[PDB]
Amino acid sequence: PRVKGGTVTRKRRKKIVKLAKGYYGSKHLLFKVANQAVMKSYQYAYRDRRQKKRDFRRLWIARINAAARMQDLSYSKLMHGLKLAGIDINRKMLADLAVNDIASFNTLADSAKKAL
Amino acid sequence: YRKLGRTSSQRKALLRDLATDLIVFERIETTEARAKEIRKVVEKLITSGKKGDLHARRQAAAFIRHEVVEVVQVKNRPVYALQKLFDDVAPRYAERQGGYTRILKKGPRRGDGAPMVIIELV
Amino acid sequence: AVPFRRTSKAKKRKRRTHVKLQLPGMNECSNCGEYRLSHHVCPECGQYDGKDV
Amino acid sequence: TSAKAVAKTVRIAPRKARIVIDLIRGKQVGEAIAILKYTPRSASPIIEKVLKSAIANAEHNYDLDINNLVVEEAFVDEGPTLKRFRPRAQGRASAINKRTSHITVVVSEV
RNA sequence: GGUUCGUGGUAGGAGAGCGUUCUAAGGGCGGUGAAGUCAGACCGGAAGGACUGGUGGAGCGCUUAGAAGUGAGAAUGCCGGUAUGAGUAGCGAAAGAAGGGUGAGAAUCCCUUCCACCGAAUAUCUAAGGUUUCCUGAGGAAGGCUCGUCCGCUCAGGGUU
RNA sequence: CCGAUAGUGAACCAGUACCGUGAGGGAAAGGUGAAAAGCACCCCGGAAGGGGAGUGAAACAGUUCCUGAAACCGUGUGCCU
RNA sequence: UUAAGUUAGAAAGGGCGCACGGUGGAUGCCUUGGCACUAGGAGCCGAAGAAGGACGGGACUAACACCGAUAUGCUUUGGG
Ligand SMILES: [Mg+2]
Ligand SMILES: [Mg+2]
Ligand SMILES: [Mg+2]
Ligand SMILES: [Mg+2]
Ligand SMILES: [Mg+2]
Ligand SMILES: [Mg+2]
Ligand SMILES: [Mg+2]
Ligand SMILES: [Mg+2]
Ligand SMILES: [Mg+2]
Ligand SMILES: [Mg+2]
Ligand SMILES: [Mg+2]
Ligand SMILES: [Mg+2]
Ligand SMILES: [Mg+2]
Ligand SMILES: [Mg+2]
Ligand SMILES: [Mg+2]
Ligand SMILES: [Mg+2]
Ligand SMILES: [Mg+2]
Ligand SMILES: [Mg+2]
Ligand SMILES: [Mg+2]
Ligand SMILES: [Mg+2]
Ligand SMILES: [Zn+2]
């Protein structure tokens, strides 16, 4: 029996074109360039799930550095201080205190100075 | 002066044809560019007419076309464009210094969008 | 000589920003009561709006 | 409330009809008809007949006020293309698209 | 069921599967709306699968097996459609003008006048070749490189002794 | 076994049209509806084509008329420029 | 008022999203036609003019089909 290429092709290509929603010009209309754009988007998203983790740690460190220099410590001294003190609060939590509860951050910065 | 998409001899022929038409019919419809050239040539023919003497008649005769305007019936004799210029048109502008013609803007022609005008004696 | 790349829809549409007609220069006549080109004769009345013929 | 007329498969290229239809969009019908009368384009007469047809529809069928009408919508859709051939040099024939237009005008009160 | 060690990968080996058409058998859905089609923020580890609503208007799933014209993005692939270049190149040697007419509409059809061109031809016969193109009356979709009321075009009648 | 790019080259006036001096080469092109009930009449328009009205289960089924994807062409606008 | 500073808004046109159309003829459903076979039959026509054609035949007939100046049919036997 003959199997004509009916429907499966259109269904598969239309899904890929829908994933290219919002892309510029031909990239959200045409299967050949949409399929490239979607493959490339997935590759970037994979790469950026790793890069995101690096980027946020750089942001936190920069904020901890700013708040620590207001207490006459560098980031490198404060983090050494907190390690010697035995304080295990991570950079995301420290950066949060440095923006939202500076009084609490100053308390930890004192604990750091004491350990040094 | 305007070149009207024509060679020198073609342009002289065109100017003579239109000049005669305006003297014969007294009101013609043509393109704006043609009308703006015709006013110069027709007003000079009427000037020759106002001058009236044989020398001016022969200067006009060198330009005006040998066309019959009408047949008057006295026997019946024809009236030639040159006779009309010197016997009919010229005298009616005896007291008027210049400005024997006027151009009324009509509108664009269907087939080529050419801006058409009425040019008329007065 | 020949297009190196096809022109995108956006680029084609930008090029055509200036490919358009202007509105004709027209106005309502008093004697006619209808629109006419300025400095032209009004056919509705059948003469020049000012100068009677 | 609104009245529409369509001229289907008019033998004029859509681009050539659109450049004119763009003048009358949003205008009062009186001004629209004037604009078309004094726009020297092949499309102007064709669009005028569609617009006057739409106005007649508005007056006869729906009993709207003709003095009060505005061109609510006007647009040109592609019709079926006539395919022709022009003989070029060296025995080659080049395609000629004799394109057609569907010209729609909608008129409304205000 | 735990424990331990593993899980980058081209050619390539191995395995498990998804989906398509058809058949069988069971069991179903469907004019209270089948397939297809469109949309969506749903589900599965993937291939993929549902649900809901629009369109559609009569056929189609599911389970287990079976059989294959069984899966496309590339072949300067084949066929069709539609873009881009672009309102761009081009519109194929040449003199036209105005008045009058016709017509829904006229640079382009008809008439008049003037102008211009060929004239050992761009004139008159005639063979070949073509085969109705000839005449008359209607026509203006397409054809005519524009227009068209006109035509070697369309439709009727005719016409060659 | 095929179901209209398939199956014959040919589902349709196909070895036709068309190409070629000739031998020869050689297409494209299926579907209104159950029934013509194939849109009287009115309106704009020279016509074409529309808008009503009517028929029909449906006319967004209107003489090539089941469905009607994508490219491509437009109108409108929420956010951006 | 002056000065210094800051910030908004804009669309000739364009982008993204959505909605609604057009074009186009994919898809599904359908089948007038094909494809491969099986069983049986039949395997030749022609000077008594074949195969295959040309031109004709209708009230009007361009085409197809049918027919041959007895031409869109004639005689006869059966069926209905
Ligand atoms: Mg000379
Ligand atoms: Mg040649
Ligand atoms: Mg691996
Ligand atoms: Mg590893
Ligand atoms: Mg293997
Ligand atoms: Mg099926
Ligand atoms: Mg479909
Ligand atoms: Mg295959
Ligand atoms: Mg392809
Ligand atoms: Mg260019
Ligand atoms: Mg140029
Ligand atoms: Mg040019
Ligand atoms: Mg020429
Ligand atoms: Mg010689
Ligand atoms: Mg003739
Ligand atoms: Mg034409
Ligand atoms: Mg004629
Ligand atoms: Mg076939
Ligand atoms: Mg199909
Ligand atoms: Mg159709
Ligand atoms: Zn006036």
Side-chain angles (χ1 to χ4, degrees):
Chain A
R2 176 162 180 255
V3 183
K4 75 199 301 300
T7 72
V8 300
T9 302
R10 175 161 49 239
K11 174 160 54 62
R12 176 181 50 79
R13 288 184 188 140
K14 196 182 290 287
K15 283 187 184 180
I16 293 303
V17 169
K18 294 300 190 173
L19 286 180
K21 175 189 189 181
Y23 296 1
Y24 180 85
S26 294
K27 275 158 182 287
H28 74 259
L29 287 171
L30 311 188
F31 171 69
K32 283 177 201 182
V33 289
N35 185 68
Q36 288 170 217
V38 166
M39 282 173 78
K40 188 64 90 70
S41 285
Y42 277 141
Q43 191 62 71
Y44 286 150
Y46 177 90
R47 183 201 59 180
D48 282 336
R49 282 195 292 280
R50 289 130 185 71
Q51 183 64 54
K52 187 202 321 170
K53 294 159 179 63
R54 304 170 192 179
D55 293 351
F56 268 104
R57 178 162 163 127
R58 283 195 167 202
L59 181 55
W60 302 326
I61 286 170
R63 296 186 177 170
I64 298 164
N65 210 344
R69 284 175 187 290
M70 284 159 90
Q71 297 292 293
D72 305 344
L73 287 178
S74 70
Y75 167 97
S76 51
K77 294 274 83 267
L78 178 76
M79 290 307 312
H80 180 42
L82 290 170
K83 178 184 176 296
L84 288 192
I87 298 178
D88 201 14
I89 310 183
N90 73 18
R91 291 159 190 61
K92 167 189 182 171
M93 291 299 102
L94 281 175
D96 184 60
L97 288 181
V99 176
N100 294 335
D101 188 2
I102 194 70
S104 288
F105 179 90
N106 293 331
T107 301
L108 293 179
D110 294 348
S111 304
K113 285 169 172 177
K114 190 175 180 299
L116 294 170
Chain B
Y1 55 82
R2 290 188 173 65
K3 318 197 270 197
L4 299 165
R6 282 166 172 75
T7 66
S8 182
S9 75
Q10 291 168 359
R11 178 162 60 260
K12 190 178 175 187
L14 177 67
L15 288 181
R16 293 177 66 175
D17 291 333
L18 289 172
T20 306
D21 291 341
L22 180 53
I23 295 301
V24 165
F25 300 116
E26 298 195 7
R27 175 177 178 121
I28 61 152
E29 169 171 353
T30 196
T31 71
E32 185 183 5
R34 290 204 268 230
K36 287 192 171 174
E37 288 310 287
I38 281 318
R39 65 183 173 170
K40 297 191 297 189
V41 170
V42 165
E43 289 190 17
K44 289 178 188 306
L45 284 173
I46 293 175
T47 298
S48 279
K50 290 178 65 173
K51 207 320 191 303
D53 81 305
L54 180 66
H55 191 46
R57 168 102 60 183
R58 288 189 176 181
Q59 286 176 242
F63 196 77
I64 204 76
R65 292 308 207 203
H66 195 242
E67 295 203 12
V68 176
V69 169
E70 58 179 357
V71 190
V72 285
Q73 194 173 2
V74 175
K75 301 182 183 64
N76 55 347
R77 296 185 65 185
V79 178
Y80 290 99
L82 181 64
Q83 292 182 285
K84 191 188 172 177
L85 172 65
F86 271 72
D87 305 310
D88 187 3
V89 169
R92 87 176 70 161
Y93 299 115
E95 300 77 6
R96 182 182 289 280
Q97 271 46 79
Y100 307 121
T101 62
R102 76 163 50 103
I103 299 178
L104 297 317
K105 293 174 174 57
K106 188 161 177 290
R109 193 202 285 177
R110 175 187 178 261
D112 64 9
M116 303 301 297
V117 299
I118 304 290
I119 184 168
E120 67 188 11
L121 298 180
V122 276
Chain C
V2 308
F4 191 78
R5 306 286 306 117
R6 67 184 299 165
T7 299
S8 72
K9 295 179 196 186
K11 181 57 175 180
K12 170 179 69 183
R13 289 161 180 167
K14 289 170 184 299
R15 183 178 69 241
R16 291 177 177 168
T17 186
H18 295 298
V19 313
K20 63 179 174 187
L21 298 197
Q22 304 307 128
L23 287 179
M26 47 170 211
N27 55 163
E28 290 84 303
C29 188
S30 184
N31 57 70
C32 296
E34 304 191 10
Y35 290 78
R36 55 173 288 282
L37 292 180
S38 54
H39 298 99
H40 290 40
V41 305
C42 52
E44 304 88 356
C45 302
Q47 79 303 304
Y48 199 60
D49 55 351
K51 182 60 63 176
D52 189 6
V53 178
Chain D
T1 310
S2 65
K4 80 178 294 179
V6 189
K8 289 210 174 64
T9 320
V10 183
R11 183 44 263 297
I12 189 171
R15 293 188 68 223
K16 293 164 184 262
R18 280 189 189 121
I19 195 175
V20 181
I21 210 78
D22 291 345
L23 295 180
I24 69 166
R25 183 174 298 125
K27 300 288 166 60
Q28 294 178 358
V29 287
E31 191 189 356
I33 292 166
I35 295 170
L36 290 172
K37 177 179 178 181
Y38 297 120
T39 294
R41 302 289 296 202
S42 56
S44 289
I46 295 164
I47 297 170
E48 190 177 17
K49 281 195 163 179
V50 177
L51 170 59
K52 289 177 170 179
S53 187
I55 294 172
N57 293 357
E59 180 181 356
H60 179 259
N61 301 343
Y62 307 115
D63 191 12
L64 300 183
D65 196 39
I66 65 180
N67 303 345
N68 203 16
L69 288 177
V70 67
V71 177
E72 188 189 0
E73 313 177 10
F75 56 83
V76 176
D77 287 338
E78 299 181 343
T81 302
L82 297 176
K83 306 295 183 56
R84 300 302 182 239
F85 294 101
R86 187 135 281 287
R88 300 297 293 260
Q90 318 289 98
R92 185 189 77 128
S94 287
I96 294 295
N97 306 291
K98 296 273 183 81
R99 296 172 180 288
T100 61
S101 306
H102 303 325
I103 301 173
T104 296
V105 167
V106 181
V107 296
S108 180
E109 287 275 50
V110 60

